[PDB]
């Protein structure tokens, strides 16, 4: 349900070390938060999000702020 | 839905 | 610069 999403902004550049699972951010970039947990529902420092051009992937929680 | 700036 | 991963 899109109308329930949080959205976030990137506070730093992030170049993905595993670009198969992770998405890149440019400082200032907006995104939507899809999940805060890993795929199995467990706590995680890596958050799943959808980028400004519709890519899905994980990013570091400490590189963003939640609008 | 969203509103800030300024990353100087 | 930036934070630790």
DSSP for C1-5?
A: -----
Asked if A34 and A56 count as a contact pair (C-beta separation under 8 A), the reply is yes
Question: What is the number of domains present in chain A?
Answer: 1
| A16-48 exposure pattern, b = at least 16 Cβ within 10 A, e = fewer | eeeeeebbebeeebebbbeeeeeeeeeeeebbb
Name residues whose C-beta falls within 8 Å of residue A48's C-beta, 6 or more positions apart in sequence. A33, A34, A35, A56, A57, A58
Distance from C-alpha of A47 to C-alpha of A30, rounded to nearest angstrom: 14
Which experiment gave this structure? X-ray
Which chain B residue is nearest to residue A10, measuring alpha carbons?
B7
Closest by Cα among A3, A64, A50, A53 to A22: A50
Measured in angstroms, the resolution is 2.1
Cβ of A12 within 8 Å of Cβ of C2? The answer is: yes
Question: Domain containing A27 — which CATH number?
Answer: 2.30.30.40
Structure tokens at A25: 């951010």
Domain that holds residue A19: 1-67
Neighbours of C3 (CB within 10 A): 11
């Amino acid at each position: 349900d899109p109308s329930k999403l949080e959205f976030a902004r990137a506070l730093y550049d992030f170049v993905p070390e595993n670009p198969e699972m992770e998405v890149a951010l440019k400082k200032g970039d907006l995104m939507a938060i899809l999940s805060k947990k890993d795929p199995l529902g467990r706590d995680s420092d890596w958050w799943k999000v959808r980028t400004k051009n519709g890519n899905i992937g994980y990013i570091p929680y400490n590189y963003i702020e939640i609008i | 839905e969203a509103m800030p700036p300024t990353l100087p």
